[PDB]
Design a protein around this ligand. Structure first.
Ligand SMILES: Nc1ncnc2c1ncn2[C@@H]1O[C@H](COP(=O)(O)OP(=O)(O)OP(O)(O)=S)[C@@H](O)[C@H]1O
Ligand SMILES: Nc1ncnc2c1ncn2[C@@H]1O[C@H](COP(=O)(O)OP(=O)(O)OP(O)(O)=S)[C@@H](O)[C@H]1O
Lengths: 8, 349, 349
């Protein structure tokens, strides 16, 4: 549904 | 008849101590909420305005305590939600609409009784933007939550699954008259106000260098707060505009902690007294020990909730051995016991 | 209906743990008092009875995780061991705080009234302690955010859990009465405490300098911990206020290591004794070998967990050719065997 993709 | 600010405040004083300005704001709001709904569709001054509340104070000041104690005396429905679990634009977490759904559980799906309810939110600081400028990338637990609440606070239609559903039956519930009580201990706000208020920011002769440890008192600093200060914190002006009222609390005074353990009914001293009452053992707490505990608690800078560490650390040995002991009818804890240089006196039958 | 006492439960944990008299007292008082708050059914004058969580702190391999494991055996009420390394701020892909609750219900057979009185344990809590300045630049999904989410879980709330994972319905379970025992070896906590206790750099003429004569001992130093010290480490004051009690554990000692191999039933010495019992061979361990093993383990700076490397590295050659050998009924390990100068003597039946 919702993708929480984050990279430091 | 209806209650009054003096009567509702007298009730909260039994459960809360040392918060004068905070009790006044909630009393006027609750006292005014009955007036707005009662005058709805019967007063010529139609489209009555609304005024939400935004509580602010240090940790352990009594924010979450006021919401619980208020439900005891409040007649209309009340709920206790949290900002941290909300998610904007229908993501993995719960949606804004879930807040209204929890209200119907306590209201028994009474829409006419749900619109006149009150709502409370805790830990509002968790959704604040980390930086002053808007985040370049999308945020799931920040600014977006504020955006979805704008139309909610002002007033908007909502979708609520009546029974056995998450996402073909929707009940409409307006929100222009629903009250919202947001609260949260904003961390780091003292640094922002100092730059704005002190304005020194210098090293030379003409620039002033405030003497170490005699400045920016949290109690006196929050009083000078303004909406512009929260913008640098991360909140959006559109969100703060929905909450005109602001309440500035104070840090727990040394004298206040002594009263919190004696005057309230749910004090820790009364709690432990009941813990040993079933054990056939009494308890005592002399004034010489209370005043000494106040200096230890304030050093922790944690609030009223950091008091159990001082008490349980002292009564650890005593509680560990009291059940094994027999013919024990009363326990006395003098001031020395708190410092750790002595052992609590025991009285046998 | 006679409940156990601290002296009785301490005898059980003493069989599995050694040299943790300070930590065992805390778990005994909490478990003891937990049944008292549970026993009450709102039939006492005291209301809103207090809660007291526990925060275990100790070196690596000192036995923190072992205390929670053995505790669940003798414990009647449910118990869990939820890893906190994988926890993520609610609203993100990785994980939610709710997952912890779901585990508790599997142990209690989905008994809400029986799960509310359960116990919860968390490991590796230092993994979420963010070490940084105020994070204006970025938002942490596993650091500061996770700790804030936990605050709502504690002190009282209502959450949502699927019925065994799944209807589109959830069950509400209060958590005001649920106890939490968070514990994780905080690495680097000694350096921050030293600044508070040493009080000086000592590059000047007047300032005193004791670089190694008065150097702080790690064991003693943790005893002097306080909540303000943890704020520098990364913890939030709001998080520490929920955990007033603190338990500091001492490092292993040469004398303590010898008792770990003999008194506990789950000792490594007894493990290898049973490993060869099925093979029809006896095992022995003389005291001269234990004293040498203790010195080698302390140098590794790993604790009790760094003991198998000393044993298995020595008995590698012996175990490799033990099955092929015949008529061997007993084995003796001398001090020289640990040093590697000689080989372990073998006996023939
Ligand atoms: N004014 C007060 N009078 C008496 N006890 C208080 C008061 N304020 C706090 N306490 C004590 O502190 C406990 C916790 O109070 P809270 O309302 O949770 O403080 P808090 O500021 O809301 O914490 P937050 O918002 O999660 S940072 C209460 O259960 C009381 O025991
Ligand atoms: N007091 C003790 N007596 C006997 N064995 C112990 C003791 N403490 C630790 N051990 C051994 O160490 C193993 C692991 O102990 P742990 O509880 O994991 O230590 P720890 O402090 O939890 O390390 P962390 O926190 O997981 S890094 C146990 O399975 C035992 O074999």
């Amino acid at each position: 549904x919702x993708x929480x993709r984050x990279x430091x | 008849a209806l209650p009054t600010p003096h009567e509702i405040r007298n009730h909260l004083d039994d459960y809360v101590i040392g918060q004068e300005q905070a009790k006044k704001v909630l009393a006027v709001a609750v006292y005014n909420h009955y007036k707005r709904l009662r005058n709805g569709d019967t007063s010529n001054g139609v489209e009555l305005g609304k005024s939400n509340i935004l509580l602010i104070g240090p940790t352990g000041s009594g924010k979450t305590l006021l919401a619980e104690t208020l439900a005891r005396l409040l007649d209309v429905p009340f709920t206790m939600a949290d900002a941290t679990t909300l998610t904007e634009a229908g993501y993995v977490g719960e949606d804004v609409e879930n807040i209204i759904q929890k209200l119907l559980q306590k209201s028994d799906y009474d829409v006419q009784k749900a619109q006149r309810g009150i709502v409370y939110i805790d830990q509002i600081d968790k959704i604040s933007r980390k930086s002053d400028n808007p985040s370049i990338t999308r945020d799931v637990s920040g600014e977006g939550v504020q955006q979805a609440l704008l139309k909610l606070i002002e007033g908007t239609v909502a979708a609520v699954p009546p029974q056995g559903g998450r996402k073909q039956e929707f009940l409409q519930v307006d929100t222009s008259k629903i009250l919202f009580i947001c609260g949260g201990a904003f961390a780091g706000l003292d640094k922002v106000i100092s730059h704005r208020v002190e304005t020194g920011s210098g090293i030379g002769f003409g620039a002033t260098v405030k003497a170490k440890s005699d400045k920016a008192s949290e109690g006196e600093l929050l009083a000078q707060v303004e909406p512009e200060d929260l913008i640098k914190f991360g909140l959006i002006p559109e969100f703060i505009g929905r909450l005109p009222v602001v309440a500035t609390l104070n840090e727990l005074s040394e004298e206040a902690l002594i009263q919190i353990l004696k005057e309230p009914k749910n004090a820790l001293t009364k709690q432990y007294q009941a813990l040993f009452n079933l054990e056939g053992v009494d308890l005592e707490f002399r004034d010489e020990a209370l005043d000494a505990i106040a200096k230890k608690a304030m050093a922790r800078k944690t609030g009223a909730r950091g008091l159990r560490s001082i008490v349980e650390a002292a009564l650890l040995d005593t509680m560990y051995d009291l059940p094994s002991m027999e013919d024990v009818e009363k326990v006395v804890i003098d001031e020395s016991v708190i410092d750790g240089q002595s052992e609590p006196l025991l009285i046998y039958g």
